[model samples]
Structures are given as structure tokens and as C-alpha cells.
Target chain A: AHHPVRDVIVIGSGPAGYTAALYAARAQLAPLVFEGTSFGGALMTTTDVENYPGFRNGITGPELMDEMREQALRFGADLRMEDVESVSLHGPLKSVVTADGQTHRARAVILAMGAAARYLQVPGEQELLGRGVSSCATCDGFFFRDQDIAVIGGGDSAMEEATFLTRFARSVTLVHRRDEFRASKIMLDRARNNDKIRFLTNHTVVAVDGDTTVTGLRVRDTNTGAETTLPVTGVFVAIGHEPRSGLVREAIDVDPDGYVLVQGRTTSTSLPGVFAAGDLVDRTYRQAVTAAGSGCAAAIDAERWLAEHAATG
Target chain B: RDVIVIGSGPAGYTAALYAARAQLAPLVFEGTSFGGALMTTTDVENYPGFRNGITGPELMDEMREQALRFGADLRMEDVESVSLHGPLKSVVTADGQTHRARAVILAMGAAARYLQVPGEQELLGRGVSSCATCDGFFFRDQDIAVIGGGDSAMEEATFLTRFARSVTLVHRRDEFRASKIMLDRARNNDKIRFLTNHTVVAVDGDTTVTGLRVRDTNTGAETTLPVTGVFVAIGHEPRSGLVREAIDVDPDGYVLVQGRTTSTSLPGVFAAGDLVDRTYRQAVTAAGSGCAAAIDAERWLAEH
Candidate 1:
């Protein structure tokens, strides 16, 4: 309640939020970042982030997030681990109330609340997240090279994951609950045509059976009560992703998929002084590097916008 | 030839790294003086991975080595011309060696314009900056001067007010080419002051900028302003010389790409980095867009 009006406030503590804070703070903006109670965003659940670039030898997800947070703090970004309760993004000044009942205000706000990858509420799935279970094929596909993997979904993302996994996996078994695919014809045909991909229709994942790393999946037929175990090294839960746009959904413009809509290539949202970055605005190429890149853009955009506004006022 | 990545900045090197990792066998042109714009930069703090921070040249070198480790064919030569209209896009280099590929990733970045004054180039990262958002933190509570008469000039001067104790905008002419709103905004700020009919002749400093020597245009008189920081907000020139005619560009001559993606107007040709991006030209953004371009080109090549 006593904090002064800040130059910028970053909401979320993912690659995007931290990167935004890094740039903003380096520019003497002195950004106050609201990292949710569960910080590190989606990457917290990830294991080895091999494709983030710049790390010759890959680093773990938690370690990478730690480095980013420290880097932001090194530049004097004020970071808080309190979850935001609500936000008011109307007009030039934007404010957000946190769970601790502190209403922090800023001239510009960057939204980097990342999306959550949908997971099957199965046993050992959460425990084996970084072990052998992953939602993003782009991040972990290379790690599963020459290994047998199973992807669970009936959407285009599932099809894309299956096709992309073929480059590294020995074979990809696509497990879908329904017989028909909801995926586009082109995506379905591409995955269907790949010799390395196999289809397992009318099946649902009952459990992810593993000790430390994933060993296989216990799947059940939707129609029948019969259950079977599919032996695989990796299981990709590609059901879908839910963008965490609930806070500013009413104030901002979002696509039908609920992802924030940015203006063109820039990270400017519909509302001036409000910018969205990371997975909240990106549906394609959801790599950590991509998220970090968008975070940089959002910070720079907010900086320039604040500068222009400062002049007018 | 699978992929041909032009330029050797964060974008080009990243594209080559990703493509080579995808088994695409990409060929990258490093442009002789490789590493692009970052070669001139000193400390690159915002590039995500390095916690403390790394030098700009060191980051580019790491990317170059990463790309090479993944089997990317990197050449130190400048591409003279490109034929991007056809399916098999061909690039002609300075050595007269032509290379053909299924897709091309253009990452030739933009260059910031300098006053070409004495000690300007030597004091670049040492108190002389082109980007306010990048180096403004280093000049906290210090007196600074921004030179130019455009919207960017007004924008940079106003932005520097947050860190600098005082901001003086030095313009060569009394009349500003900037818009009314921009000019009005700068005039209204209490922290901002203006010096018209003055042009910068020399940046006075040895290790870093100490002050600026400005000559009055009307009176032909010279005065030295004791400024610790000098920001040249004149403008930037996008390196679109190779693709100006072959690809679609805006009035400003920056290559225009499809919405959000790095795909240009011409098929099989993709543009990234500062060449296509004018708003946020950070190294990380360029690298991200370059990754997107390479992925787009890879997918397009897979289809065709």
C-alpha cells in the first residue's frame, strides 16, 4: 500500500517476465515484478532445456530460471513472490492488487502470464514431469532421440508433436480417445503419412507408470473396460494448453483461443501502456528462447510507450 | 543445399544453429566481419542466459561455435546478390561463388547512424549510446545531450530524463522535423532543455564522453557543453541493400514480413532480425525471429 507509483510493473516470473524486467531495469525503469506464488512459470516443471540456446551444455529448467531471476535482480528489478488477485488496466495508469492486499501502480504494465500445458490427471504424471514426461516436443524431442515415445491428443498440436518427434524418436504412437481426429486434414495426413508414427485410437491414458523416469503408460479403451500398458520411454501430453489470461481477459483483446493479441510483430497489446509477451500471446513455437525473446520486445515496447506518454503529460 | 542463412548476428547464427541441429545442413555467410552489430557493443546484459552478463562479441562467438558444433557450414564472405524468386534460391557472393538452397534466411541487421565526429566511434559504449533503453541505466543522475530533430530524437531525450539529471536536446536547425505532438511533449517536460541552431562538431572525451563541442550555425561560434553522456538519436539504416528490389519493403525500406512470422512477400525467402524489425531490435528478439524464420523455411522446404 505504501509503494510509490513505479515506472513499470511486470506480472509473471517466467522467461518472458524476467527478461522484460531485465531490459526495463537496465534502462533505469526500476520495474517491480509480481512473480506468482508458484514462480518460474511453465518451465519450472520442465527438466533439461536443451534448446534455449547459448548454453553449450544444456542446463536444467530450474537452474535456467534461477539465472534469469538473478540477472533481473542484478540490474535492480524489484521482484515479489506474491500472487496478483486482480488488475485494473484502464487508462494511462495501470494497477494490480496482489494476494497480500498491496495495490501496486505503474505507468506501464507487461503481462507475461504463461500458458499451462494440459495434463492427464494420472498417477505419477506430476512426479515424472522432468523425468520422461513433457508437453513440448520442441524442447525435449532431441533428448528422446532414437527412443520410443507416445503422444496423447487428437488435436493439431498432437499431430505436429508426433511428426516432429519422428526426427528423434524411433517410433511415435499417437494415443487419442476418439477414433476421428479433430486435427486439420493436412496435419493429420502428414502425421499419418510418416512411417515412424503409429495410431492408437479409442484409447485414454489411465496412468503414467514409472519409478523415476517414465517406463510406459497404462491406457484404457473408452468404449470397453479393457486396459493395456504401452511400453515407451517418453509420454507427451499434448491435449492442449490454456493461456493464463484470466486477470486481464476483460481489459485486453485476445484471440478465440484466449491468447492475448499483440499488434503485428511488436508486443503492444490493444491497450496502450499494456503489453503481453511469452506464452500468453504466443501459440506457435513455444520454446523458452521464443518466450525470452518476446519478453525483451515487450519491455522495449513498454519503455518507448512510457517515454512517449511522459512527454505528453 | 538445404538452408542458406545470411548475416552473422545473433539472428543468423541462431538460425544456423537450429537448422543444423534439425539436420538441415545449413550454410551461413558470416559477412567477413562476422558477429554483425554486436561486434561493436561491449557489455550485453539482457541476452537471458548469462547471469552476470557477457560481452557482445563473446555472445556472438558462442553462438557461432554452437552453430559450428552442429555442422553448420559458416563462410566468411559477403553475399553480393540473391535470386529469391525461384524455388531454388541462389546467392552470389563477393568471391563470385554462387550457392543455391531450397530456402534463405535473411538476417542482415540495421546499422545506427553516427555523427562521424571526433571521438564518436571510440567512445561508443563508453558514455556514447544510440539506444536509450539499452544504456540509459549507466547514466543515472548524469547530465546528457541527445542530438537529432526527429521523433526518435524527442523520444530518446524524454526517455533519458528518467536516469539523467538533465537532458539537453541539441538540434542543428531552429525548425524541427518532428511531429507537433512529439515536439510539444519534449517542450513540456521540466527536465528537458533545448539548444537550437547548434550542430555537434566533436565528442570530447578520451576513455568515455566528458562533454560535446557544438558550433552555432547562425553565429559560427563554438561552445562546449559539459555532458557526461552523449546519445545520438539521429536514425538507423536497415541493411536491406541485398533485398530492396527482390523483396517487399515499406516506405522506410525495411523488409516487410507477414504478420508475426518471418516469411517475406517472396516465397522461399524469409527475413528476420533488424532487417524486418524496426520497433524492438534487441539481439534476443532478432534471435527469436531468426529461429522462427528458419523453422518457417524448414517447414516450407519440407512441403515443397
Candidate 2:
């Protein structure tokens, strides 16, 4: 059975979803938000999130997400803890089906299903994630000031991460399994020009070695079958990101990278009454503030859409 | 000397509070009208804190107090000019006092562009509103008139349709400049009525706004639209006279900052809040951007 119609329905309870709920609910839209499997989003898995503002002493990432959720609930947002499996955003009335087979409908829908950083899933990588192995170069790079760090990947993401890490890291080693990089010449030039970045071709990270945090990594040459240990305090996995848009892949137009593309700063997708936000729609500057900002835009857009449809029809 | 922040709105104050806690003793000047345009408003429902929501003036006061609660030195003086070319940025106030700091944050906000018609000023709090999203709740179950034909005007009318018994959007143009979807939705709303090819020449009122004197722009005929409230949604001009030429101003006159960063064209000078923001102008958004500006300023100062 499906729930009755709602004014607004927001999927994925992240910084973007909760923020949209806060705005939509306060406008008396009475938004129904799906919290999903990971109620707190990607930040929930993170141990410390010192970047987000409002906290002087700094709070845990999960704690911040919890506070945001509570604030959204306090504003009369109906938060239902369920995983939305599929959504139909074709017509005036949008339908969202949950994994538990419960369906919900709304005049407008906001998809804030954030993206996740792709991990190599190597041995000991998960255990030493926050300790030393980090994915976001913009986030954890500042911590390793004047320290050595290694990035694993052969694409533009790896080269960019390595170059950005040069702002803090004293030395950055780019370890790739192939001699030729998949990154563009410009990005490769930037990485090569950076005196601090050293490229190690034909090398792959076999195992991450660290007691409490990332101390070093075991690298093996794919060609020579030689194993070498590279000592570094931090490891940045600059593989890529996968935006969760499987439900709306054929429904809307996405960029080559699969991230939902919006009309510059606006969350309006290809289809009407459908809006995507957060990491799902953003490939650059995927910060909490930016996501929250997009969420606000989506809610306002949805509200305007509903108002016009209700008035004219 | 670490950080010098101009204006004391949500953006400036939030930046100050964050910078102060980060061991950066930020100096903030809270001008004459410290809380910006929202100071004149009544209830603020968007800010995340306080579930029940608080008044605009009260919310501004709380944010100001909270900023000062940290080590931030808050002053009640308006910054007259800025010198962003030098290593140590300067913020000169109207009182002929000059304060030098490593980094400067510009949160100088913009004011709502009003019609400046008769009875508009007299019925400000009584009925006339500049922000429909902010002041729409007060006019519940009453007829209200919105002025403008842009996206904001359409969005405001649509949002007001939730509470307003009937909303008549008055635009001088025959056709709307809003997006097709927005135009479609607003035109379709049961409570929203569009008054195209009409202009509000004069606002009528006794104590509060009793009605509006509208004119058919095409036909030289004028008539009175009996409505209890007026919302001026024409547009907003960013107040950039202080630093528009010196700073990189967008085509719309908004100060141009680095992508998502408060770093403007000039080093050591960062702009935050509405002065630099062109879209999604909300208090929470302004506050969040203000927080970003403070962090950026703090880092810039520390690095230098």
C-alpha cells in the first residue's frame, strides 16, 4: 500500500535532504523525508568532521548529521526511516517506492542521494580509513602539513588530489599500476611540474600497513614483480565518485560522469517536478555548505512548481 | 588585527563567532542597523536553531550576542571604506577611525528595492512587505497584492498562496519574465491572480495599507485594487557603492568572489552574505556562507 499524497517528498537524509526538509517544512509544506538505510548519510561513517561550521570545538560527523535531522524534525518535517528503492518522476504526481514495498507520492520530489568516494577495498584499507587512509584530499590534506603522503590512481582525480595535497604535504607520491596515466595532459603536466609530486609507475598498493593509523603501504610492481614499502603518514585514495542515480538514469540526462546535471546553480532536472541535489548533482565543491545551498534551491523550486500547478489547474 | 569583518548581519556575526573560536580574534563592526533588512521583520522561521522560530530582531540579537560570547570584539560603527591592496587590509569607519587587520570580510548586505509610493512606508509593518516568503504568514486569510513579474515575484506569489486567501501579482509588463514552469504553476494556483499590464502608482491606506491605486500601463486608465497588503517583489540592487569599483562587480553589480570562496578579486579582502550571493537569498544560507567566509579569512590570515 502507498501513503497518501504529500506536498513535498525528499529522498536520502543527508546534508542536502535534511536542509531541504528544514526549508520546505518551515514554509508549512509538511515535507515527508525518507531517511534511508544510512540515516545519517556518508558523514555518519566519518569519525571527525572539523570542517563544518557552527562548532568551535569540532563535533563528530555523525553528531552533526543527528543535530541537523533533529532540527528538521523540530520544524514539523515528517522523517520516515526507510530506503527508497525506486521513484517515478515523470508526471505531475511523483511516486517513490521504498525497499520495504511502501510507496509515497508528492507533488514534487527532491533527490539528495549523495555520492560516495570509490575505495580500492584493499586489505587493511577500511581499518585505517580515518586514522591515515583518507579519500577527500580537500578535507584531510591540511592535517598532514609538511608530511609525506601517497595517492593511488591513474586518472585525473588522482593527479588533482596529488597536486592539491602539495599545499600541505611536503612530498606526494602518485602510485599507478600503468606507466601511462588516464588523466589529461594538462592535469598530468600540473602533477609533473609540482616538485613535491613523484610518479611511481607499474606499482599498485598491495596492503596498507599501520598499527593505529596509516604508517606506510606495501607497493608491488606489476611488471617486475618487485615489492617495495613506501613510508607515508597519509594515503589518499583518489579513484573517483559514483553518484547514486540508478533509479533515474534513463528518466533524466546525466553528465558523462553519471552525476545528475542541473541548470547552473538550479536543481531543476530534465523532468518536471523532479529535482536532484547534494553530491548526486555536484561533482565539484561537494562540501556540506554547497550541498545545503543546493537543497534550499531545490525546495524553493519545488514549492514554486507546486504553487503554479495548484493555481492554474 | 587578525580578522576585520564589515557589517553585523547573520553572515558577519557567524564569521566572527567561528573565527574567534578558532583563536582568531575577529573585529566586527555592527553598523547603525546592525541586523540588516531582517531587523525590520517580525518572525524568522528558517534558521535551524529554535524549533518554534524567533522574531527577526530577536534572532539577530541572539546571533550577535552569540558572536560576542566568543572572543570576537563587536563594535557599533559603520565601515566607510576599505583598502584591500595592501598586505594588511584596512577598514575605515565613518567615525574617521581606521582598523588594520590581516584579512577583511565584507558582509555588507543589500536592501529591498521598494516602490517608494505613497502609503508604502506608512504601512510597512502593518501590511506592506518586501519579502513575501518572510512576511506572507501575517496576511493569512486576507487578500494581498504582489508587485513584480520576475522569478522572485512568481516564487513569492506561489509561496503566499499557501496562506493568503487570494494573491494578485501586479506586474507592469504584459508577459512575465519568470521561468515557464514557475509561470505555469503560479498562474495555475487557485488563490493566485495575475494583474498583467498594470502598475501600482500609489498605495492607499489609513493606518495600514487599505488598498493600492493601480494603472493599466497600456491604456492610461487607473483603478484601485482593494487589498490589505502590498509586497514589492520587483528586485534588489546590491549596495556596492562602497566597494563596487574596487572589487570585481558582476553584471548585476554583486561583488564577485572566487568560486564558492569568499576570496574576492583583491587579496586579503573577502565578501560574504547577500553582497556576493546572487541566488538562494535565505538567512540560513547567508549565515552558512558567512561561516565559510570566516573560515576562509582565518586560513588566509594564518597562511600569510
lDDT per residue (tens digit) for residues A1-313 in model 1: 6855688999999999999999998887889999989899787877676656677666788899999999999989999998999999998678999998889898899999999989897987988997899998766777788998999999988988788788789989999998899999998988889999999999888898889888988888766767899999889989899999999897899988799999876889999899999999989878777899999988988877877676555
Query: Interface-residue RMSD per candidate?
Result: 1.5, 4.9
lDDT of 1 by residue, B1-304 (tens): 8899999998898888788877789999989877877887788878897897888888888888888887899999999998899888899999898999989999988899999997799898888899887777788899999999999999889878888989999999989999888898889888899999998999888888988998876787989999998999988998898899989999888999988888999988999888888877688888888788878887787556
TM-score of each: 0.94, 0.72
Query: Looking at every candidate separately, what fraction of the true A–B Cα contacts under 8 Å does it contain?
Result: 0.55, 0.16
Residue A135, model 1: lDDT of: 90
Q: How many residue pairs clash in each candidate?
A: 0, 9
Q: Please tell me which predicted candidate would have the highest DockQ against the true structure.
A: 1
Summing lDDT over every window of 10 consecutive residues in candidate 1 chain B, give the lowest-scoring window.
B295-304
Error of 1 at A313 (Å): 3.3
User: Model 1: how far is A226 from its true place, Å?
Assistant: 1.8
Candidate 2's displacement at residue A14, Å, is 0.5
